Scaffold this active site. Sequence first.
Site, PDB file in Angstrom:
ATOM      1  N   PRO A   1       1.286  -1.118  -0.416  1.00  0.00           N
ATOM      2  CA  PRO A   1       0.168  -0.275   0.348  1.00  0.00           C
ATOM      3  C   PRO A   1       0.784   0.918  -0.245  1.00  0.00           C
ATOM      4  O   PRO A   1       1.949   1.177   0.815  1.00  0.00           O
ATOM      5  CB  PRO A   1      -0.691  -0.449   1.313  1.00  0.00           C
ATOM      6  N   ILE A   2       0.904   1.921  -0.667  1.00  0.00           N
ATOM      7  CA  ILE A   2       1.503   3.528  -1.069  1.00  0.00           C
ATOM      8  C   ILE A   2       0.946   4.669   0.228  1.00  0.00           C
ATOM      9  O   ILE A   2       1.848   5.928   0.666  1.00  0.00           O
ATOM     10  CB  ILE A   2       1.393   4.312  -2.731  1.00  0.00           C
TER      11      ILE A   2
ATOM     12  N   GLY B   1       2.536   6.086  10.269  1.00  0.00           N
ATOM     13  CA  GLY B   1       4.209   5.934  10.506  1.00  0.00           C
ATOM     14  C   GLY B   1       3.671   5.549  12.283  1.00  0.00           C
ATOM     15  O   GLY B   1       2.690   6.321  12.773  1.00  0.00           O
TER      16      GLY B   1
ATOM     17  N   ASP C   1       4.048   1.662   9.482  1.00  0.00           N
ATOM     18  CA  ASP C   1       5.283   1.376   9.651  1.00  0.00           C
ATOM     19  C   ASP C   1       5.606   0.916  11.146  1.00  0.00           C
ATOM     20  O   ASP C   1       5.401   2.032  11.528  1.00  0.00           O
ATOM     21  CB  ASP C   1       6.273   2.335   8.798  1.00  0.00           C
TER      22      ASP C   1
ATOM     23  N   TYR D   1      11.387   2.182  18.289  1.00  0.00           N
ATOM     24  CA  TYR D   1      10.514   3.367  18.020  1.00  0.00           C
ATOM     25  C   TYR D   1       9.969   2.886  19.921  1.00  0.00           C
ATOM     26  O   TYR D   1       8.939   3.744  20.415  1.00  0.00           O
ATOM     27  CB  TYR D   1       9.068   3.515  17.705  1.00  0.00           C
TER      28      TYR D   1
ATOM     29  N   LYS E   1      12.394  -2.555  11.464  1.00  0.00           N
ATOM     30  CA  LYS E   1      12.911  -2.442  10.884  1.00  0.00           C
ATOM     31  C   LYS E   1      14.318  -3.222  11.847  1.00  0.00           C
ATOM     32  O   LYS E   1      14.098  -2.751  13.043  1.00  0.00           O
ATOM     33  CB  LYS E   1      13.365  -1.073  10.708  1.00  0.00           C
TER      34      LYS E   1
ATOM     35  N   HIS F   1      17.023  -0.824   9.219  1.00  0.00           N
ATOM     36  CA  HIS F   1      17.260   0.944   9.990  1.00  0.00           C
ATOM     37  C   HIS F   1      17.713   2.181   9.297  1.00  0.00           C
ATOM     38  O   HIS F   1      17.825   2.730   8.347  1.00  0.00           O
ATOM     39  CB  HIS F   1      16.695   0.716  11.329  1.00  0.00           C
TER      40      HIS F   1
HETATM   41  N1  NAP Z   1      13.530   5.020   8.705  1.00  0.00           N
HETATM   42  C1  NAP Z   1      13.577   5.808   9.780  1.00  0.00           C
HETATM   43  O1  NAP Z   1      15.073   5.935   9.589  1.00  0.00           O
HETATM   44  C2  NAP Z   1      12.730   7.170   9.702  1.00  0.00           C
HETATM   45  C3  NAP Z   1      13.472   8.252   9.947  1.00  0.00           C
HETATM   46  C4  NAP Z   1      11.926   8.644  10.809  1.00  0.00           C
HETATM   47  C5  NAP Z   1      10.819   8.512  10.188  1.00  0.00           C
HETATM   48  N2  NAP Z   1       9.891   7.415   9.646  1.00  0.00           N
HETATM   49  C6  NAP Z   1       9.194   6.551   9.563  1.00  0.00           C
HETATM   50  O2  NAP Z   1       8.086   7.517   9.261  1.00  0.00           O
HETATM   51  C7  NAP Z   1       7.517   8.471   9.290  1.00  0.00           C
HETATM   52  C8  NAP Z   1       6.211   9.258   9.072  1.00  0.00           C
HETATM   53  O3  NAP Z   1       7.395  10.195   9.748  1.00  0.00           O
HETATM   54  P1  NAP Z   1       7.976  11.079  11.051  1.00  0.00           P
HETATM   55  O4  NAP Z   1       7.067  10.407  12.339  1.00  0.00           O
HETATM   56  O5  NAP Z   1       8.960  11.446  11.132  1.00  0.00           O
HETATM   57  O6  NAP Z   1       6.992  12.623  10.605  1.00  0.00           O
HETATM   58  P2  NAP Z   1       5.576  12.862   9.832  1.00  0.00           P
HETATM   59  O7  NAP Z   1       4.925  12.364   9.921  1.00  0.00           O
HETATM   60  O8  NAP Z   1       6.364  13.908   9.056  1.00  0.00           O
HETATM   61  O9  NAP Z   1       5.243  14.054  11.340  1.00  0.00           O
HETATM   62  C9  NAP Z   1       4.280  14.064  12.472  1.00  0.00           C
HETATM   63  C10 NAP Z   1       3.715  14.722  13.048  1.00  0.00           C
HETATM   64  O10 NAP Z   1       3.353  15.378  12.075  1.00  0.00           O
HETATM   65  C11 NAP Z   1       1.769  15.501  13.044  1.00  0.00           C
HETATM   66  N3  NAP Z   1       1.114  15.482  12.153  1.00  0.00           N
HETATM   67  C12 NAP Z   1       0.512  14.662  11.334  1.00  0.00           C
HETATM   68  N4  NAP Z   1      -0.872  14.735  10.858  1.00  0.00           N
HETATM   69  C13 NAP Z   1      -0.913  16.047  11.030  1.00  0.00           C
HETATM   70  C14 NAP Z   1      -2.234  16.574  10.576  1.00  0.00           C
HETATM   71  N5  NAP Z   1      -3.103  16.778   8.856  1.00  0.00           N
HETATM   72  N6  NAP Z   1      -2.211  18.071  10.064  1.00  0.00           N
HETATM   73  C15 NAP Z   1      -1.501  19.062  11.328  1.00  0.00           C
HETATM   74  N7  NAP Z   1      -0.186  17.916  12.214  1.00  0.00           N
HETATM   75  C16 NAP Z   1       0.138  16.480  11.679  1.00  0.00           C
HETATM   76  C17 NAP Z   1       2.073  14.550  14.010  1.00  0.00           C
HETATM   77  O11 NAP Z   1       1.217  15.163  15.225  1.00  0.00           O
HETATM   78  P3  NAP Z   1       0.276  13.988  15.796  1.00  0.00           P
HETATM   79  O12 NAP Z   1       0.608  12.305  16.163  1.00  0.00           O
HETATM   80  O13 NAP Z   1       0.412  14.631  17.498  1.00  0.00           O
HETATM   81  O14 NAP Z   1      -0.985  13.868  15.636  1.00  0.00           O
HETATM   82  C18 NAP Z   1       3.621  14.798  14.261  1.00  0.00           C
HETATM   83  O15 NAP Z   1       3.980  15.746  15.190  1.00  0.00           O
HETATM   84  C19 NAP Z   1       8.018   7.557  11.465  1.00  0.00           C
HETATM   85  O16 NAP Z   1       6.065   7.885  11.806  1.00  0.00           O
HETATM   86  C20 NAP Z   1       8.293   6.043  10.910  1.00  0.00           C
HETATM   87  O17 NAP Z   1       7.361   5.852  10.770  1.00  0.00           O
HETATM   88  C21 NAP Z   1      11.398   6.675   9.076  1.00  0.00           C
HETATM   89  O1  ZST Z   2      16.058   6.095  12.736  1.00  0.00           O
HETATM   90  C1  ZST Z   2      14.282   6.278  12.731  1.00  0.00           C
HETATM   91  O2  ZST Z   2      13.710   6.045  11.986  1.00  0.00           O
HETATM   92  C2  ZST Z   2      14.558   7.950  12.855  1.00  0.00           C
HETATM   93  C3  ZST Z   2      15.406   8.686  14.320  1.00  0.00           C
HETATM   94  N1  ZST Z   2      15.758   9.177  13.603  1.00  0.00           N
HETATM   95  N2  ZST Z   2      17.028   9.835  14.561  1.00  0.00           N
HETATM   96  C4  ZST Z   2      18.393  10.363  14.104  1.00  0.00           C
HETATM   97  C5  ZST Z   2      19.059   9.399  12.955  1.00  0.00           C
HETATM   98  N3  ZST Z   2      20.271   9.703  12.498  1.00  0.00           N
HETATM   99  C6  ZST Z   2      20.441   8.424  12.720  1.00  0.00           C
HETATM  100  C7  ZST Z   2      22.434   7.835  12.276  1.00  0.00           C
HETATM  101  C8  ZST Z   2      22.689   6.758  12.652  1.00  0.00           C
HETATM  102  C9  ZST Z   2      23.741   6.810  10.750  1.00  0.00           C
HETATM  103  F1  ZST Z   2      23.727   5.715   9.991  1.00  0.00           F
HETATM  104  F2  ZST Z   2      24.300   7.743   9.846  1.00  0.00           F
HETATM  105  F3  ZST Z   2      25.399   5.493  11.767  1.00  0.00           F
HETATM  106  C10 ZST Z   2      22.450   6.042  12.737  1.00  0.00           C
HETATM  107  C11 ZST Z   2      21.024   5.488  13.197  1.00  0.00           C
HETATM  108  C12 ZST Z   2      20.555   7.431  13.206  1.00  0.00           C
HETATM  109  S1  ZST Z   2      18.576   7.596  14.137  1.00  0.00           S
HETATM  110  C13 ZST Z   2      16.930   9.737  15.890  1.00  0.00           C
HETATM  111  O3  ZST Z   2      18.373  10.016  16.787  1.00  0.00           O
HETATM  112  C14 ZST Z   2      16.106   8.929  16.485  1.00  0.00           C
HETATM  113  C15 ZST Z   2      16.248   8.286  18.006  1.00  0.00           C
HETATM  114  C16 ZST Z   2      14.946   7.921  18.486  1.00  0.00           C
HETATM  115  C17 ZST Z   2      14.018   7.027  17.613  1.00  0.00           C
HETATM  116  C18 ZST Z   2      14.261   7.053  16.656  1.00  0.00           C
HETATM  117  C19 ZST Z   2      15.024   7.976  15.652  1.00  0.00           C
END
Ligand code: NAP
Ligand code: ZST
EC number: 1.1.1.21
Length: 314
Positions: A12-13, A17, A42, A47, A76, A109
């Site tokens: 699903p697209i 989060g 996700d 987390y 992850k 991750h």
């Molecule tokens: N792979 C990685 O390293 C990585 C890193 C960062 C994030 N992610 C994943 O990506 C997801 C999305 O990124 P994110 O959590 O960083 O932030 P985001 O989705 O860009 O922003 C979430 C923020 O926006 C608010 N929000 C949500 N819908 C809103 C709306 N319709 N109007 C106004 N505010 C709204 C939320 O508040 P409330 O929740 O209080 O409503 C929360 O404060 C994560 O939760 C995670 O699952 C992965």
């Molecule tokens: O991870 C999430 O989903 C969001 C995320 N991002 N960041 C920034 C990060 N920057 C990084 C850089 C490296 C590196 F690969 F660069 F070493 C490794 C790991 C990280 S975590 C955080 O510090 C973090 C802390 C708690 C939970 C989630 C997060």
Amino acid sequence: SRILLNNGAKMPILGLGTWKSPPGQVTEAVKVAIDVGYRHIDCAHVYQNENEVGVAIQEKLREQVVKREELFIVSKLWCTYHEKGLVKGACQKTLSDLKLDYLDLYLIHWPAGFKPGKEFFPLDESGNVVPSDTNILDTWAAMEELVDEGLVKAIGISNFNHLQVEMILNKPGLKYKPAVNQIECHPYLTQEKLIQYCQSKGIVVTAYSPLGSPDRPWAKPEDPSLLEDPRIKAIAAKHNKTTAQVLIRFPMQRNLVVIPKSVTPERIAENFKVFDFELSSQDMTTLLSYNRNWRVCALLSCTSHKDYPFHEEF
Ligand SMILES: NC(=O)c1ccc[n+]([C@@H]2O[C@H](COP(=O)([O-])OP(=O)(O)OC[C@H]3O[C@@H](n4cnc5c(N)ncnc54)[C@H](OP(=O)(O)O)[C@@H]3O)[C@@H](O)[C@H]2O)c1
Ligand SMILES: O=C(O)Cc1nn(Cc2nc3cc(C(F)(F)F)ccc3s2)c(=O)c2ccccc12
């Protein structure tokens, strides 16, 4: 509503989060999400809420609201588990917490390995992250094993630059190609080169922090704010949509998967109402024009890690 992956499954697209969703609020958030149509969640061990997501999924399977096969659950492998001998355990902990017997997708991750231990961010006394002596290819090989054992249906990567992706693609004796690369992507970090790279390699890109992660714990008052950007507000008003809906629709129209986070029931619902409008060509052009190469996620204490991903251009 779904995109085909290299394993033949459909993803699903639009997904939910869960980073920064506190445990109990997240149980209600997932229940509400499932009720209004979300089928992709996700998750991540780091987390600290997978049990509570698990509770929600379990209950709605039980309520007969959805079947397991209709859900797309992603988690992850955290940085402190990159050693080959720790990967299966890490995955099984996630499966146990989520109360599932398989994941649809499991990602590395971050490309960097950290020192094993209880701490998710092990630091030395001067605040530098403590690396582990692990490498991408060995970790990838361990992820491959999870597919062969049936724990996960697909594997992929996250926060990998194109050189790091290439290392995997060019591995002699590669068993599974990465299905997905999940990276930060929004109008201030538009990722044109990495997305082009990935899509040309048949790797699906998922955009995280599509709203600019306003709740990120290291936000500074002076930082740019996407949801408050009056230029984007004006695009939204024209469509009688909110800024958030425009920000979620934007990556959908670039053939990306997108995973906005919310624990607010009205927002959870709002963010899913994005299949009934289209951004125009000019809108799309305008939004890409706002690129500033600004990153939400890039932890300073990791910048000397051998595998830090963002020294490279892309
Ligand atoms: N792979 C990685 O390293 C990585 C890193 C960062 C994030 N992610 C994943 O990506 C997801 C999305 O990124 P994110 O959590 O960083 O932030 P985001 O989705 O860009 O922003 C979430 C923020 O926006 C608010 N929000 C949500 N819908 C809103 C709306 N319709 N109007 C106004 N505010 C709204 C939320 O508040 P409330 O929740 O209080 O409503 C929360 O404060 C994560 O939760 C995670 O699952 C992965
Ligand atoms: O991870 C999430 O989903 C969001 C995320 N991002 N960041 C920034 C990060 N920057 C990084 C850089 C490296 C590196 F690969 F660069 F070493 C490794 C790991 C990280 S975590 C955080 O510090 C973090 C802390 C708690 C939970 C989630 C997060």
